[PDB]
Amino acid sequence: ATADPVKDYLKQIGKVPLLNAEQEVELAKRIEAGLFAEDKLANSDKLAPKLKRELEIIAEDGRRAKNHLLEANLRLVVSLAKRYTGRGMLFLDLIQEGNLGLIRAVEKFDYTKGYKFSTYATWWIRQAITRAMADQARTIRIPVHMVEVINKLARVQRQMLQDLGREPTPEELAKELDMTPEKVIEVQKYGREPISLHTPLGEDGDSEFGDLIEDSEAVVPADAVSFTLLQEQLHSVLDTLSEREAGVVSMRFGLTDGQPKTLDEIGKVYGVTRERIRQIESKTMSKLRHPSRSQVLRDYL
Amino acid sequence: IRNVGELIQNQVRTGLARMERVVRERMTTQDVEAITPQTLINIRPVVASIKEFFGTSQLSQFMDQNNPLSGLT
Amino acid sequence: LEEIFEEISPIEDFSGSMSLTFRDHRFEPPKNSIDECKDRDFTYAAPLFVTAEFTNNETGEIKSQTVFMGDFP
Amino acid sequence: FDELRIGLATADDIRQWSHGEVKKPETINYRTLKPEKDGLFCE
Amino acid sequence: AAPVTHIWYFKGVPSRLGYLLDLAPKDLEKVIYFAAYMITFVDEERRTRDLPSLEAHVSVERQQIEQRRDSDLEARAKKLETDLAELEAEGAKADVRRKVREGAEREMKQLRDRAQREIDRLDEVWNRFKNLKVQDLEGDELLYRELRDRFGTYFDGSMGAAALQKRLESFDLDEEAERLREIIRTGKGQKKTRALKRLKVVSAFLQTSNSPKGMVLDCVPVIPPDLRPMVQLDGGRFATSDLNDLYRRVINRNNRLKRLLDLGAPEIIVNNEKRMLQEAVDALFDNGRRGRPVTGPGNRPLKSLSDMLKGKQGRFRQNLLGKRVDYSARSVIVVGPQL
RNA sequence: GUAGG
Ligand SMILES: [Mg+2]
């Protein structure tokens, strides 16, 4: 229990027996032995109790051998995690993920292949690490195909930089990736990272860059009170019209309720026909459009 | 006093240290007869470091241009 | 510049078979005029090349190639 | 406003405050720029 | 899924920690963060009840150990004599018998070495069994496994925040207060001073209705989204508060721990995973209260909830006792006499 | 960072 828990993790690895060919092939023989033992146990057919306990013991020994391989190869994952560190995910977290990939590879390995476990494993370990780096590294979650598109175009653009010794023109990048310039700009803009608010901007007193930028959800009191005066004047101007006329226009434009009613929709509560209400709505349009009830509303827009 | 040359050299030195570790890693993970000086080096650390020194660094300061004297000072 | 290149010894693998020598560095005229750089928001830099020599004892051959590290402010 | 009692918040209290829970590290979609489901910023 | 303890109450002055469990800060540091074991509970009455039986089993074990050791010594002597006699009869060289006898006695010494090492192992495990008590730390994991193997169903042990949570759930603070009052009535020196400090905290817990188990939080709240805005920024860029990153870290690690616990996994990996979860939670509440902080982008440490509420730039002294105000202005001031 | 208070 110390600071920099990665050092504690390496101490937790400790000294464990590295396995020579005979050792791990024998261990895997015991693994498949325990596998068959648990397969027999799982069968609903009745087995003698002593035989079942023997099979359980064999399976437990197999589990211990699995653990031995895990601990022996813990050193292998730590090296592979270092091979991918420094890309926005923490080192021991990468080591944990590589350990998961190792668990997968170990669960999916046998001596049927005439090779060492490590060569087979390197593939699964890199698979798990790259998956997690694509799925959990960025603040914004980028899909795997998008991750490979962006890193492919990035590496090939870097290759163009090294080759030409100059910034490749976007059309060159588009033909290289074979996609259109539109996709190029799309993925390029999709391939950024946020800048944190809690960063020193200028002096310490200025502090966070968060303070500098204004928001948008804030209700501007000027605009809100402008809208309030517009509402009051509009209601008064409607009251200037006849009662039925004002009511029908209000329903046609939802001045009492947020949803305006269609013409026929107004012709149910009032008892008027859709064309009658249409007609009087047009007459209200005529009555309001006079210069009389327009000077006040013109300045409100 | 660390005049400008030594500062820029220090940052270039850091960049070349990054380049050394990168190329060493590449050689540890590269096959013989497919290695060229053109291919093995990555120029990103050097350009990034010198860039990171001229932007976002206290000693790299905005040049005041109020007058010639403030210049020289 | 040549000093910082020199102190970087040629990289040696665990076998020590291979080495990269950075003998001579050189510059080229900047592409953009100073007025043009100021007007168009470009970092006034120049190309910096270096002759990297690959030498492997196992191959017993020397392969010289000029490489470009990046625009130098 | 008469007193600001402060003290240990038990697990039951935290559950009571919670209107739900979070299950993912997802924040928003890169393309729709909209909140994802059952993650951070989950509407 | 795996409980953790809340950073503030621990890893600090002894007033907030309060010595609520009579264990040194090193004990807690080496237990919570995974490293050393705890004996949460022991059926010491049960162990005391069956002492003659277990003592007889141990005696029989020693008796058979000595019997087989005597048999091994007899076999050693017979082997030595037989090889000496047969090589001296052979007479292949001048002194073959002396060399083979030297090898035989070296083998005998080595066998004695393993005899004494296993005897020592039995003795130490037995006296540790006789050294059982609650809140007992077991740093050596191999030793603890030996304890479990040699005898189970009598002692209960654990690791991490779970052990602490069980301890506090089972804790009887009233008896601690009583015995500490007794100690203060008749006590001298540093022990008395420690007891006085402890009395304060236990009485504070006892008079308060809340249970001490709040030390081990289980469900981590989350800041409302607006208060940690991922506000859009012009230019295709984004602005995020570090708390989003901390929450991403903690939820991710909890997800991975769920994934492990779901399948059958070893004890080492699950314990490391729980340690990682504890690290994430502690960083969330306090980044930098232990060792290097979570530097995030690497240029500077990541902000934390407690970090927000503290200091010159904190909430209290910058945004509750001093606020910007609408309807204000500023300008140079010049002298006008006729006013 | 750097100037004024
Ligand atoms: Mg003044």
d(C-alpha E197, C-alpha A57), whole Å: 53
d(C-alpha A39, C-alpha A186), whole Å: 52
- Contacts by E104-113, CB closer than 8 A, 24 or more apart: E104/E76, E104/E79, E104/E80, E105/E80, E107/E76, E108/E76, E108/E80, E111/E72, E111/E76
For A200-215, letters b (16+ CB in 10 Å) and e give eeeeeeebebeeeeee
d(C-alpha A99, C-alpha A77), whole Å: 6
Per DSSP, the three-state class of A136 is helix
CB A137 within 8 A of CB A88: yes
d(C-alpha E61, C-alpha A287), whole Å: 113
Tokens at residue E60, please? Answer: 């029989």
Report the residue of chain A nearest B28, measured CA to CA.
A83
Cross-chain residue pair D30–A136, CB shorter than 8 Å? no
Four-CA torsion E158, E161, E162, E166, nearest 10 degrees? 90
Q: 10 Å Cβ neighbour count for B60?
A: 14
- For strand F, is any atom closer than 7 Å to the CB of A203? yes
| Angle at the Cα of A150 from the Cα atoms of A147 and A151, rounded to 5 degrees | 85
d(C-alpha A246, C-alpha E211), whole Å: 65
Cross-chain residue pair A96–E292, CB shorter than 8 Å? no
Please tell me the number of Cα atoms within 13 Å of E13 on its side-chain side: 4
CA-nearest of A107, A39, A11 to E266 is A107
Q: Which of A92, A136, A192 sits opposite E236 (nearest CB)?
A: A192
Phi, psi of E66 (to 5 degrees): -70, -35
Q: Give the distance (Å) from ligand 1 centre to CA of residue E337.
A: 20
Pairing of strands A195-196, E239-240: parallel
Q: Residue B73: is it exposed, middle or buried by C-beta count within 10 angstroms (0-12/13-18/19+)?
A: exposed
Å between A186 CA and nearest CA of chain D: 10
CA distances from A284 to A249, A275, A277 (A): 7, 14, 10
Flag whether residue E279 sits within 8 Å of chain A, measured between CB atoms: yes
d(C-alpha E119, C-alpha E113), whole Å: 10
Amino acid at A230: L
Give the bridge partners for A208, in sequence order: A200
Instruction: Please give residues of chain A from 25 to 54 whose alpha-adjacent beta carbon (CB) lies under 7 Å from any atom of strand F.
Output: none
Report the residue of chain D nearest E210, measured CA to CA.
D8
Q: Residue D2: is it exposed, middle or buried by C-beta count within 10 angstroms (0-12/13-18/19+)?
A: exposed
Tokens at residue A156, please? Answer: 């090939």
**Please, which residues have CB within 8 angstroms of residue E203's CB and are 6 or more apart in sequence?**
E177
d(C-alpha A156, C-alpha A153), whole Å: 5
d(C-alpha E41, C-alpha E133), whole Å: 8
d(C-alpha A281, C-alpha A279), whole Å: 5
Radius of gyration over alpha carbons of chain D, in Å? 16
Tokens at residue E235, please? Answer: 């230019």
CA distances from C4 to B47, B53, C50 (A): 16, 17, 12
Tokens at residue A64, please? Answer: 């211990």
Tokens at residue E29, please? Answer: 């540091």
Phi, psi of E189 (to 5 degrees): 60, -150
Alpha helices in A43-90 (DSSP H): 49-72, 74-82
Tokens at residue E238, please? Answer: 């984004």
- For strand F, is any atom closer than 7 Å to the CB of B56? no
d(C-alpha B70, C-alpha A105), whole Å: 67
The sign of the dihedral angle between the CA atoms of A24, B28, A162, B11 is positive
Report the residue of chain A nearest E25, measured CA to CA.
A1
CB A27 within 8 A of CB A69: yes
Query: Separation of CA C51 and C1' F1 in angstroms?
Result: 39
From chain A, pick out residues whose CB is under 8 angstroms from the CB of E242. Answer: 196, 198
Give the bridge partners for C50, in sequence order: C25, C67
Residue to test with chain D: of E4, E168, E208, E230, most D Cβ within 10 A: E230
d(C-alpha A231, C-alpha A256), whole Å: 11
- Give the position of tokens 């209000």: A250
d(C-alpha A46, C-alpha A59), whole Å: 18
CB D35 within 8 A of CB D41: yes
| Angle at the Cα of E31 from the Cα atoms of A80 and D25, rounded to 5 degrees | 50
**Please, which residues have CB within 8 angstroms of residue E296's CB and are 6 or more apart in sequence?**
A196, E242, E245, E302
CA-nearest of E19, E14, E22, E17 to E5 is E17
Pairing of strands E239-240, E37-42: unpaired
Pairing of strands E37-42, E155-158: antiparallel
CB A148 within 8 A of CB A132: no
Cross-chain residue pair E248–D27, CB shorter than 8 Å? yes
Per DSSP, the three-state class of E87 is helix
Q: 10 Å Cβ neighbour count for A124?
A: 20
Helix H or strand E encompassing C52: strand C48-56
d(C-alpha E180, C-alpha E196), whole Å: 8
Per DSSP, the three-state class of C23 is strand
d(C-alpha A101, C-alpha A70), whole Å: 11
Kindly report the three-state secondary structure assignment for every residue of B2-20. Answer: CCHHHHHHHHHHHHHHHHH
Report the residue of chain E nearest A89, measured CA to CA.
E296
Query: Separation of CA E297 and C1' F5 in angstroms?
Result: 36
Flag whether residue B36 sits within 8 Å of chain A, measured between CB atoms: no
d(C-alpha A262, C-alpha A242), whole Å: 20
In Å, what resolution does this model reach?
4.1
Give the bridge partners for C19, in sequence order: C55
d(C-alpha A196, C-alpha E246), whole Å: 13
Q: Which stretches of chain B sit within 8 Å of chain C by CB?
A: 9, 12-13, 16, 20, 23-24, 27-28, 32-33, 35-38, 40-41, 43, 46-47, 50, 54
Phi, psi of A174 (to 5 degrees): -65, -45
d(C-alpha A180, C-alpha E19), whole Å: 67
How far does Cα C35 stand from its chain's mean position? Answer: 28
Q: 10 Å Cβ neighbour count for A178?
A: 7
Q: Give the distance (Å) from ligand 1 centre to CA of residue E331.
A: 13
| DSSP 8-state symbol, C10 | P
Cross-chain residue pair D14–E219, CB shorter than 8 Å? yes
d(C-alpha B34, C-alpha A162), whole Å: 17
CB C45 within 8 A of CB C71: yes
d(C-alpha E35, C-alpha E138), whole Å: 9
The residues in C 28-47 lying below 8 A from B, measured between CB atoms, are 43
d(C-alpha C21, C-alpha D7), whole Å: 69
- Contacts by A47-51, CB closer than 8 A, 24 or more apart: none
Alpha helices in E13-134 (DSSP H): 14-17, 25-32, 44-49, 51-90, 96-129
CA-nearest of E121, E171, E133, E120 to E48 is E133
Measured between its terminal Cα atoms, the distance across chain B in Å is: 16
Tokens at residue E244, please? Answer: 């989003």
Secondary-structure breakdown of chain C: helix, strand, coil percentages, each rounded to the nearest 5 = 20, 40, 40
CA-nearest of A134, A136, A156, A154 to A146 is A134
Cross-chain residue pair B38–C70, CB shorter than 8 Å? no
**Please, which residues have CB within 8 angstroms of residue E318's CB and are 6 or more apart in sequence?**
E312
d(C-alpha E160, C-alpha E217), whole Å: 13
CA distances from A277 to A246, A250, A251, A258 (A): 12, 12, 11, 20
Measured between its terminal Cα atoms, the distance across chain D in Å is: 31
User: Strand C61-68's sheet: what is its strand order?
Assistant: C18-27, C48-56, C61-68
> Quick one: which residue's CA is nearest to F3's C1'?
B64
d(C-alpha A271, C-alpha E98), whole Å: 130
d(C-alpha A280, C-alpha C23), whole Å: 94
d(C-alpha A244, C-alpha A284), whole Å: 10
Secondary-structure breakdown of chain A: helix, strand, coil percentages, each rounded to the nearest 5 = 65, 0, 30
CA-nearest of E238, E239, E240, E250 to E287 is E250
Flag whether residue B44 sits within 8 Å of chain A, measured between CB atoms: yes
- For strand F, is any atom closer than 7 Å to the CB of A202? yes
